[PDB]
Write a protein that binds this ligand. Structure first.
Ligand SMILES: O=C(O)/C=C/c1ccc(NC(=O)C2(NC(=O)c3ccc4c(C5CCCCC5)c5n(c4c3)CC(=O)Nc3ccccc3-5)CCCC2)cc1
Ligand SMILES: O=C(O)COc1ccccc1C(=O)Nc1c(OCc2ccc(Cl)cc2)cccc1C(=O)O
Length: 551
């Protein structure tokens, strides 16, 4: 069937930023017919996946538990209540939610309505490698449906992918654990070969059968009868497809592929990508495969069979994925160095700690992170990508010297160090105070993230070249600025001094000892690197469970 059909009604609105203008160009690419042919490898992998799902027991979340998971700036319902009413458990919100739930149990076939919208993302043009990227599309149900999805499937999408995929499930890893996983997998091979597989419009490649196969994996869970019916009903009425409405309420057409803004998007895409990839590994006869999957993002680390043989197996893997309705964007290329693999926009690099020991870390080209931070400094934004990049890329040269220095000077000038800000980690929203950054960093990357040096020449040059192309002052200027930022932070004591001492120890002439932060243990990060929730509409506020009086 067609991934999408359109009426003609426009997708209306609600260093460039992506707009609803370019939505017409995106529609053309994501609109096609799917031809999927399944085989014995696919059927075998599926049965193996279902046997592991059979060990999962999932709980039905209460209305209150589901309401607490709703982000405060989550789109309001078309039925007279918003995200604040949901979080406060107002009678109107709760009554509406309970009737939407009852309707999921009684109606098994009527397609649920969704809103289509062009996502606004900040990119960096540079007319040296083509032109501007068209806006991505976001398809999501009403607020009431979104709360019901959490009641029925929040525990499923948080527990099941790990039980099914094991160590291949990428969202269970902090950046430090992701690093450790890839390094260990690379070292486990006699002669390693690795590749990244990029699918062309993954959401659009997802067929109705893929969505039903995904439900067959969920149905293997021990579930409450009502959860079981809600999964069945949500699959038919929402997940498989349904009508699309623009921001103006006009009928835009119809979808028969994956919706980007449903709770099961990340889980479903990870399960589908893993299933198709593991099956294709068998068709291509790749030896001792190690996969790492985050939605549509796949990395394969395997045993090399020779330069000509690896190229042949990669074309075979591609032919199999294409048959499964997952053709590539860019053709995959075999890499024989771990650093040469770019997965989830990131690559492995090495540095040294204070005692000269090797430390592997994840980094990426810093153009987009810096362009986005520049946009966010210029105008007020709901999500601060700068904060997420400080969190995820804390050991990197660019995040330490530029992002930490720039944003801590602004927070110092605005006296906003204690003000909690929202950031997105694995598709989920987190309300974090900048003053908690040293404890967060120690927990995800280790105490060494504050003492890293001996960066590679390639990494230094990439960062340096990037600062030049963007008009950012050189690294020597940042060192000077960090010294004042650090001095002012130290003078304030408490968590602010810890920000000075730990985040800016790289800037001082004579470096400090740096002992573990005692209050880092009491930080509750149990909901952090568990699962992916892209378009899932998930919120968590950071908690410091059991505080000592002297901390
Ligand atoms: O010794 C030498 O040889 C050269 C010395 C030298 C060169 C330039 C400066 N610049 C400045 O002082 C000013 N800008 C900055 O001190 C500045 C700070 C952050 C900047 C950023 C980002 C960096 C990441 C966090 C968010 C801010 C960008 N740009 C920045 C400029 C340059 C800019 O204006 N815009 C962009 C656009 C895209 C990407 C980055 C930028 C402030 C007043 C005048 C301009 C200072 C010293
Ligand atoms: O790494 C990037 O360039 C963007 O990643 C981020 C940076 C800051 C804030 C959030 C993200 C993020 O959650 N990224 C994601 C991801 O990363 C997987 C990974 C893990 C650790 C590192 Cl160091 C790099 C990549 C896998 C799948 C989906 C997403 C998502 O966008 O929701």
């Amino acid at each position: 069937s067609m991934s999408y059909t359109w009426t003609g009604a426009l997708i209306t609105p609600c260093v460039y930023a992506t707009t609803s203008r370019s939505a017409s160009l995106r529609q053309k690419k994501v609109t096609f017919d799917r031809l999927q042919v399944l085989d014995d490898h696919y059927r075998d992998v599926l049965k193996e996946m279902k046997a592991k799902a059979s060990t999962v027991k999932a709980k039905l979340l209460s209305v209150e538990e589901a309401c607490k998971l709703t982000p405060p700036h989550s789109a309001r319902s078309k039925f007279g209540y918003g995200a604040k009413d949901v979080r406060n458990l107002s009678s109107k919100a709760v009554n509406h939610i309970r009737s939407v739930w009852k309707d999921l149990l009684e109606d098994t076939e009527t397609p649920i309505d969704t809103t289509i919208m062009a996502k606004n993302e900040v990119f960096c043009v540079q007319p040296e490698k083509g032109g501007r990227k068209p806006a991505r599309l976001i398809v999501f149900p009403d607020l009431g449906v979104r709360v019901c999805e959490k009641m029925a499937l929040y525990d499923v999408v948080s527990t099941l992918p790990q039980a099914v995929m094991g160590s291949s499930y990428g969202f269970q890893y902090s950046p430090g654990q992701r690093v450790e996983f890839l390094v260990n997998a690379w070292k486990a091979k006699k002669c390693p070969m690795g590749f990244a597989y990029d699918t062309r419009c993954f959401d659009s490649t997802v067929t109705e059968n893929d969505i039903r196969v995904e439900e067959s994996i969920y149905q293997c869970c021990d579930l409450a009868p009502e959860a079981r019916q809600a999964i069945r009903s949500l699959t038919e009425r929402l997940y498989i497809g349904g009508p699309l409405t623009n921001s103006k309420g006009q009928n835009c057409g119809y979808r028969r592929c994956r919706a980007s803004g449903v709770l099961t998007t990340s889980c479903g895409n990870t399960l589908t990508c893993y299933l198709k990839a593991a099956a294709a590994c068998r068709a291509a006869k790749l030896q001792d495969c190690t996969m790492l999957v985050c939605g549509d993002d796949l990395v394969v680390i395997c045993e090399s069979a020779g330069t000509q043989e690896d190229e042949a197996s990669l074309r075979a893997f591609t032919e199999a994925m294409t048959r499964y309705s997952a053709p590539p964007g860019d053709p995959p290329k075999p890499e024989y160095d771990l650093e040469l693999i770019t997965s989830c926009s990131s690559n492995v690099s090495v540095a040294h700690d204070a005692s000269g020991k090797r430390v592997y870390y994840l980094t990426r080209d810093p153009t987009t992170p810096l362009a986005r931070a520049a946009w966010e400094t210029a105008r007020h934004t709901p999500v601060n990508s700068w904060l997420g990049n400080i969190i995820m890329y804390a050991p990197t040269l660019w995040a330490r010297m530029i992002l930490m220095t720039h944003f801590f000077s602004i927070l110092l000038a605005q006296e906003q160090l204690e003000k909690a800000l929202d950031c997105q980690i694995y598709g989920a929203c987190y309300s974090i105070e900048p003053l908690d950054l040293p404890q967060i960093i120690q927990r995800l990357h280790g105490l060494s993230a504050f003492s890293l040096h001996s960066y590679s020449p390639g990494e230094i040059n990439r960062v340096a070249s990037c600062l030049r192309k963007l008009g950012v002052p050189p690294l020597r200027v940042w060192r000077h600025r960090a010294r004042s930022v650090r001095a002012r932070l130290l003078s304030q004591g408490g968590r602010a001094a810890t920000c000075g001492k730990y985040l800016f120890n790289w800037a001082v002439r004579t470096k400090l000892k740096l002992t573990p932060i005692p209050a880092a243990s009491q930080l509750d990060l149990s909901s952090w690197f568990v699962a992916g929730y892209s378009g899932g509409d998930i919120y968590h506020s950071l908690s410091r469970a059991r505080p000592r009086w002297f901390m």
